Amino acid sequence: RSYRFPEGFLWGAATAAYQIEGSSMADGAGESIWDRFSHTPGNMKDGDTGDVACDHYNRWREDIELMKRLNLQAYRFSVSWSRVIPQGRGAINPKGLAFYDRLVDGLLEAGIEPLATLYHWDLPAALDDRGGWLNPDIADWFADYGQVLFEKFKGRVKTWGTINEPWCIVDGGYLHGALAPGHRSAYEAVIAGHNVLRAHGAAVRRFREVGEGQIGIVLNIEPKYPASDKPEDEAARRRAEAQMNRWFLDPLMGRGYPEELTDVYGAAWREFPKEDFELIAEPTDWMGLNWYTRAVPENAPDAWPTRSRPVRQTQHAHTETGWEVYPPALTDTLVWLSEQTGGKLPLMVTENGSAWYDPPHAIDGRIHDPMRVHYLQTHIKALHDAIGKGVDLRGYMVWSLLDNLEWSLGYSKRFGIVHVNFATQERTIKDSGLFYAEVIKTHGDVLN
Amino acid sequence: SYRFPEGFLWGAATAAYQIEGSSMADGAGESIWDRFSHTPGNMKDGDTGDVACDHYNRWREDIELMKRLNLQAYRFSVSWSRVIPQGRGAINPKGLAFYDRLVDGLLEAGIEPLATLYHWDLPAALDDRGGWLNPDIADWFADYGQVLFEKFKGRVKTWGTINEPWCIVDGGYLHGALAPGHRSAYEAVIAGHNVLRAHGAAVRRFREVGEGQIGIVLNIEPKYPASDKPEDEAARRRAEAQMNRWFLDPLMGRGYPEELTDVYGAAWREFPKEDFELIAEPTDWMGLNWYTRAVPENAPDAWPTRSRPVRQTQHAHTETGWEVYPPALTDTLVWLSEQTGGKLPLMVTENGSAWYDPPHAIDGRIHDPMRVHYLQTHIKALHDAIGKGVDLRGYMVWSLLDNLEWSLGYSKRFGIVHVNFATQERTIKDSGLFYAEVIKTHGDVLN
Amino acid sequence: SYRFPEGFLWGAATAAYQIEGSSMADGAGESIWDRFSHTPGNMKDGDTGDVACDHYNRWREDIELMKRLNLQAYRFSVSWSRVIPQGRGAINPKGLAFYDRLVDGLLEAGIEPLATLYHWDLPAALDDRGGWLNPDIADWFADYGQVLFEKFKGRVKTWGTINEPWCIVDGGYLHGALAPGHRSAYEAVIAGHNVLRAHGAAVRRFREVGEGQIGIVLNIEPKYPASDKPEDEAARRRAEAQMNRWFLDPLMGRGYPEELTDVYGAAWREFPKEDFELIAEPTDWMGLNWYTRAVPENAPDAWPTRSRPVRQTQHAHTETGWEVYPPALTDTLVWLSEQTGGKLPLMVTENGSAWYDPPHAIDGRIHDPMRVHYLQTHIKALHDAIGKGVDLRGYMVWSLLDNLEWSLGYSKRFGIVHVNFATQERTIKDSGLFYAEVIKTHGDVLNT
Amino acid sequence: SYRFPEGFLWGAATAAYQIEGSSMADGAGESIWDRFSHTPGNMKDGDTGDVACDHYNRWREDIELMKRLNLQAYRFSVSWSRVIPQGRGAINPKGLAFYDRLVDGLLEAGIEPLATLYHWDLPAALDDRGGWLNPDIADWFADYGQVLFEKFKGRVKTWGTINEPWCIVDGGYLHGALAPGHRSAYEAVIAGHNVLRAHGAAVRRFREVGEGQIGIVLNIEPKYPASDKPEDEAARRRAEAQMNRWFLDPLMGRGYPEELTDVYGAAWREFPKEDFELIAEPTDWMGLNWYTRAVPENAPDAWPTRSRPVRQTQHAHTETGWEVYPPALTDTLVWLSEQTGGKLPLMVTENGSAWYDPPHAIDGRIHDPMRVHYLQTHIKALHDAIGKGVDLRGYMVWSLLDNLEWSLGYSKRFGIVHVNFATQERTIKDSGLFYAEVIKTHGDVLN
Ligand SMILES: OC[C@H]1O[C@@H](O)[C@H](O)[C@@H](O)[C@@H]1O
Ligand SMILES: OC[C@H]1O[C@@H](O)[C@H](O)[C@@H](O)[C@@H]1O
Ligand SMILES: OC[C@H]1O[C@@H](O)[C@H](O)[C@@H](O)[C@@H]1O
Ligand SMILES: OC[C@H]1O[C@@H](O)[C@H](O)[C@@H](O)[C@@H]1O
Secondary structure, eight states: OOOOOOTTOEEEEEOOHHHHOOOTTSTTOOOBHHHHHHTSTTSSGGGOOSSSTTOHHHHHHHHHHHHHHTTOSEEEEEOOHHHHSTTSSSOOOHHHHHHHHHHHHHHHHTTOEEEEEEESSOOBHHHHTTTGGGSTTHHHHHHHHHHHHHHHTTTTOOEEEEEEOHHIIIIIIIISOSSTTOOOOHHHHHHHHHHHHHHHHHHHHHHHHHOOSEEEEEEEOOOBOOSOSOHHHHHHHHHHHIIIIITTHHHHTTSOSOTHHHHHHGGGOOOOOHHHHHHHTOOOSOEEEEOOOOBOEEEOTTSTTTOEEEOOOTTSOBOTTOOBOOTHHHHHHHHHHHHHTTTOSOEEEEEEOOOOOOOSSOBTTBOOOHHHHHHHHHHHHHHHHHHHTTOOEEEEEESOSBOOOOGGGGGGSOOOSEEEETTTTEEEEOHHHHHHHHHHHTTTGGGO | OOOOOTTOEEEEEOOHHHHOOOTTSTTOOOBHHHHHHTSTTSSGGGOOSSSTTOHHHHHHHHHHHHHHTTOSEEEEEOOHHHHSTTSSSOOOHHHHHHHHHHHHHHHHTTOEEEEEEESSOOBHHHHTTTGGGSTTHHHHHHHHHHHHHHHTTTTOOEEEEEEOHHIIIIIIIISOSSTTOOOOHHHHHHHHHHHHHHHHHHHHHHHHHOOSEEEEEEEOOOBOOSOSOHHHHHHHHHHHIIIIITTHHHHTTSOSOTHHHHHHGGGOOOOOHHHHHHHTOOOSOEEEEOOOOBOEEEOTTSTTTOEEEOOOTTSOBOTTOOBOOTHHHHHHHHHHHHHTTTOSOEEEEEEOOOOOOOSSOBTTBOOOHHHHHHHHHHHHHHHHHHHTTOOEEEEEEEOSBOOOOGGGGGGSOOOSEEEETTTTEEEEOHHHHHHHHHHHTTTGGGO | OOOOOTTOEEEEEOOHHHHOOOTTOTTOOOBHHHHHHTSTTSSGGGOOSSSTTOHHHHHHHHHHHHHHTTOSEEEEEOOHHHHSTTSSSSOOHHHHHHHHHHHHHHHHTTOEEEEEEESSOOBHHHHTTTGGGSTTHHHHHHHHHHHHHHHTTTTOOEEEEEEOHHIIIIIIIISOSSTTOOOOHHHHHHHHHHHHHHHHHHHHHHHHHOOSEEEEEEEOOOBOOSOSOHHHHHHHHHHHIIIIITTHHHHTTOOSOTHHHHHHGGGOOOOOHHHHHHHTOOOSEEEEEOOOOBOEEEOTTSTTTOEEEOOOTTSOBOTTOOBOOTHHHHHHHHHHHHHTTTOSOEEEEEEOOOOOOOSSOBTTBOOOHHHHHHHHHHHHHHHHHHHTTOOEEEEEEEOSBOOOOGGGGGGSOOOSEEEETTTTEEEEOHHHHHHHHHHHTTTGGGTO | OOOOOTTOEEEEEOOHHHHOOOTTOTTOOOBHHHHHHTSTTSSGGGOOTTTTTOHHHHHHHHHHHHHHTTOSEEEEEOOHHHHSTTSSSOOOHHHHHHHHHHHHHHHHTTOEEEEEEESSOOBHHHHTTTGGGSTTHHHHHHHHHHHHHHHTTTTOOEEEEEEOHHIIIIIIIISOSSTTOOOOHHHHHHHHHHHHHHHHHHHHHHHHHOOSEEEEEEEOOOBOOSOSOHHHHHHHHHHHIIIIITTHHHHTTSOSOTHHHHHHGGGOOOOOHHHHHHHTOOOSEEEEEOOOOBOEEEOTTSTTTOEEEOOOTTSOBOTTOOBOOTHHHHHHHHHHHHHTTTOSOEEEEEEOOOOOOOSSOSSSOOOOHHHHHHHHHHHHHHHHHHHTTOOEEEEEEEOSBOOOOGGGGGGSOOOSEEEETTTTEEEEOHHHHHHHHHHHTTTGGGO
8 A cells, every 4th residue: 555645745834923923013013913812811721822932933943944854845834914014004014024034035945835824813903993804995905915925925935825714714703702803793704704705816816916826725624524314413514514614615616605604694694796706706726725623513503603513523532622533534525625626726735733732841852742643644644545536635734833822722732743842942843743754755655 | 948950951861772673774774783782692681672662663652751751851862873874975864864853853842852973883884994993983973973963953952972982992892791892902992092082073073064062971980989908099090090080081181091001001002192182172061971889999800990899788779780879979970070170061961770660560550669769869969969069951861761771681671761662562650750740840849 | 358268367477597697696506507608609699697687686576566567477487406406315495495485475465376397497417417318307307396396385386397398309409509508319309208208207296295286388389381382281290290299299198290200210219108108197287388480391401300481571570580470379279279179278378579679778668569569469369269269277478577588698588577687677668568457457458 | 770679569549439330230239429420510521430441340351451560469449339238237248249259369360459448439328327427427437347357358458448538528528529519618527527537447446357457548739839928828738738637637646737727717626535536546557649739829719728729831731630740749758758757658559640542542552651751750759759768668550440530530541551431442551561561670660
């Protein structure tokens, strides 16, 4: 059984700005919604903030050396909007942009392909005071922001992500309020989802106008499996699936919004002008999939708003985030996604990984995380299985390069293949990282 | 004796979303409360303002009720989104026509219309543009004000701009118990500033295109000492600054309270010099909303004022949990008279109490002796305040009707007229009958 | 007319721990409520019965208030631990002397003393031996009963054994909202059984050494249909069985309700037959405590009866959240008459309502029109019940005094006499003033 | 070097309700955990001990597992309700026959049986008589003890009376998180006293009819300073007194800690002198159950010790939220040696850690590196304690099997042998393998 991956298959690791950078108000950088959110009592586990995080803003060179040691061929990262344009619109912050300039040059020097994401949940607070994702004008704002980077890194950054996980942004930020900006409203949720899609489309158009290379959106998908043969449970499954997995993909593929949403959001649902949908379906060059687990939803009449709830799959191992470990569902998702996009759209797993308990410090220079290693090997094999079934998969990015701030869950959830001691900023490569380095090095042959 | 000054104006007060119903009828736009009340968990028993008192349909009956109560003034608010569905742009003819009919009808009955521009029901379309976090609202509001100023020129002579900035910001942006349901000190500071600016802009617009008298309406809750411990006094001043001085001081041209720098910490901001010039734009009158006092003590974990009220078990409490203590009204009025230098005519735009009443009348009656008591003792307290030199021009009872007490739903009844929400049947309570006699005798019944 | 039958006895009721105070005074022992009320979280506002109405010291004043109210009867309870500090053994002379003086004072006033042996205040020493879970309590109780039976032989002629077995067991052992604060269906079943046995043993002992009439006091909350749906009728029957028939049926020699097997499942037990012979020991009268009705519907997650009341929003509710609905009193009396075969003399030993009153009088008055309304409508309902052939001999208002409403503390005022708990000053409410007229006119005032 | 003293006994520990299952099978009576676990809300995920590890049926397999681990001792508890169904009266032949078979099987395997009389599973019939609140239990327990003492005379030579009085009382009577689920300080004080008395009575009875060595087993959680704040030191001493000195002190003839008067307030009681004579009956050995330390700070609303632990984020924490800090073991042992005058032979009857393991093996393996780390560091800490003169005779790993962690259910795995609760399949973890090597080399594997 060979597990050699196709020629040119790109191996890498991923991060996000607010989760690792720190130095949030340094060198002209503006205030973001997460600056506000994390400094409001009760919002974050243990009162954790992104003020320091992995201190990546200061230690990025060391982190690049770590990327070299892991044999990374790509590094997926996001750019902080508020660091580059403090008020979201208007004046550019020279120092802030200069950081990412140095970073990208350093990556290219090391032979690492820089994969940049425009928006990873950190909207400028100044734009939030103008309504944030509820204001349609954001489609323009985002575009302008996108342009600034497109021209600045022309020929250096060739592969672009627009939005990272619209569902997390809207469902967490506007529907239930567990994430910044912390709103709880179905009305706002539908409007926000629509404007996130529109902003993506606008950014793609602007990219056609001034940019060079390939651009696409990044979706998280959590495949919904049957709980039973009861029709109410199938209705539950379809509601959950529609709200989470089809909400954004369908209009991006020109299929409009899922019918089930009319039922999920009820009186909060809206009909939008057709030209919005033409803008939203603006053709992309590639698509990123963020994948971690599956769910098995059953009917739940009091669960707002999808009226569904996951059934705990006690037959399998679970991560520290409470996610079932089940690799075949990755293969299934990749096939499903290939079908939804017609096989015409190049795909990349832009995020995959797992959180398990690690001690806060290295133990004799080591971190032994056997379950993370297991997750890594089984899911990469599942990737190979997906390619064997004809899915056009071009690459794989491990979430995450570093133990970092897992947003509202703080530092308690470690996703890194590199351990970070948050007291000393000391980095220690985990057994999972060592293994991943070997997987890259053998181009998959180590799995045989 | 308790006879009141000549020309002293007696009335009752309401607000649009709390009584109107028909929130989406006849072109009416969606407001932030339409959204808020239809989100599960926000409202007690899942109550909404969809029907309320059905006043949009029964306003004539309600006016006849005003006549039975001998009212000389009626304080009400205009729903911004009913008049301007998108907050800016096209006027909604029927929505404006409702208030046209209402005001004309009031004038026919000899009742003075006291109009409030904003009573917490922001158009949702403006909320999607940031609401009170967007400085442009100062202009938006002004334009809205103009529409009314010109429409009711010569008919509505007494105007309120904003009703209770503190409730709007503290409830709506700081703690999130009210629409639009945000919870942020940063947003609270910005929103408070833009509320004050909006008031100023509306007053300027009124100077250019309006006719009559214009002013803001503040709620004040006097903070009394819990002890002689210094940390408790510091607590008292934090609470007082955050609730009672936050808006009054910049309105009187004295800037923001120093204590706010301590209350909001990193969320506090410095604002441009000209903003305070706009905010202190001279007004003609001021409204006071008053219900109770508080006795704050130090509470380090209470965010963000680090203070909390001490339950005053020696006195009666309302169904909203507010201490019954009329002397604090007198004091407050005096205090207010002093903060505004005595030059600014004051009016009690809201005062009243919530007690349990049955959901239906009992042989054509509702017996509410505690509400009657609250009424008589606090009106006497008004007389005492006038005796100490306060230029107090009138008194409006909250409320004319049992209505939607926002997030607390219909469970909190403030009306001097009972509303059976099953049948929309109105029954005048004993408090209403008594209030009618207080008006007719111009206070002599209190002797 | 609303004139009541000849000899119809009007009175008012209290309980020891709710009014007395002086819980550890003059040799008095520790009760389960002494412990319970001084455990944080158990009582609203941290209220205790340490002082209450200070009745232990102000009983003479309270008797003068009874005369002013024209009371013909005063129903009160005797604190077991005040009379027998350890529950068994040595008698406390001063403690017993209190009730001696009280009873003599009542007789001096021309007031019928109505004594209750047990009103929820078990001696802590007996609770340490298992309390109502220990079958030997049937004997302990009997012995305690004997002490009183002999002491007031010829003075107290009408005796209550247990006040509301359902509240004792459901509140004290099933859900833990009342002392001793256990939460167990197993314990609930056993405790209910032993409470019934204790009642029987006490009645037998009364036959051996006592004089007059003896009976139990049950509270009943009639369960009305929420719908004609069979699941709701089954729910109604479960609730009715657990609350209204659990104790009445074995007392009438009918055994335990079948539905209990379904309600309690694995916690249900079969008991020896002679136990049921003991439980059905013939009594002379029965007390009904009545306040409201319920309208139960099916509720699969409601433990353990799988039912829940539907809020009857068309009617007024008290501050304890109880629907005001007088016809249900009439129905209940009829029902009870039918269950007891018409052969057992009935008395309403508790009826009343809680509404907000200020903490102090207002120029010498307390105006409680809703309590007055409750009083007049429910007394009229009694007349209706007598008109339907129910053998009703009397009516006791709960309560004579504002007192400690157990776990709900002093916030719930049931008194027709207001108590300022800051000053212990008594002020007769409008309800008391009206009730005095009801007694005086023997019901004729309800006409005019 | 880490070679241990000659005769140092290596073993592993379990408890009856946590592993046996078949709780009311073969004549066995109902225990308080039978009731408690089958009452909704009491147990995580609704887990019960109905099946557990099915040890009642699979004990032979488990003994083969003990042999593969090179165990020299197996510490287990006897279910009171399995042996005497009503707690008093008739013996249950089958229930006793199980432990007879078990003990013979262990002796046959060359494994020293260490028996515990009470590990939290009081017979329900005795709970209906007041349980640990009824002083008569001192006698009941004694009788129960006698039954075992005589049945296993010459076979079971090392006896434990009570396992962790503090958990029994604090969990079962003070806070109500454990069976019998009471929450009362009054009851907590009484129950603690009667547990101590029961221990004494059992020791006396053992002197009359038993053979071998008898002792109690205490859990100790050493309390370290959170700060130099005096309120925090007072907090530390309250917590220390309530948890670590409550039982040890009267066992050593020093009476109850003074601080308890402050902790329990009005619930505290004075007891007869002869009670303390009974409680201090001389024992032959003492068991220490040890897992972690705590760092308490002042907490006025924390009932009743008014203290709370400060999270030590510089160190690793187990899945039960317990800090991993091996030196505190060494210190504790020394402290215990000092409190007992160095004259009383000590044994660590429980030490171990809970980390996440998958519910099934991979592949026929369970890799638990943190449990291995915990094991090596704490065993080294034992060696350090022995080097300082502590008379430590043995070490028992908690636990032999993944089992029911009481109210936290099966989610907390303490086993050095993994149990697949779907299939009852046992798989020796890396920790078990390593421990087997530690026993074999008598410590030399550590170096
Ligand atoms: O929750 C784990 C991860 O989920 C990903 O899909 C998000 O992009 C990350 O920001 C987050 O850390
Ligand atoms: O809480 C009672 C009343 O308080 C007033 O100050 C507000 O303006 C009303 O909207 C509210 O119903
Ligand atoms: O719930 C109010 C009243 O209910 C009666 O059934 C109880 O016997 C009283 O003790 C209690 O005060
Ligand atoms: O909490 C983990 C362990 O703690 C020990 O002290 C108890 O004796 C065990 O029964 C329990 O499983």
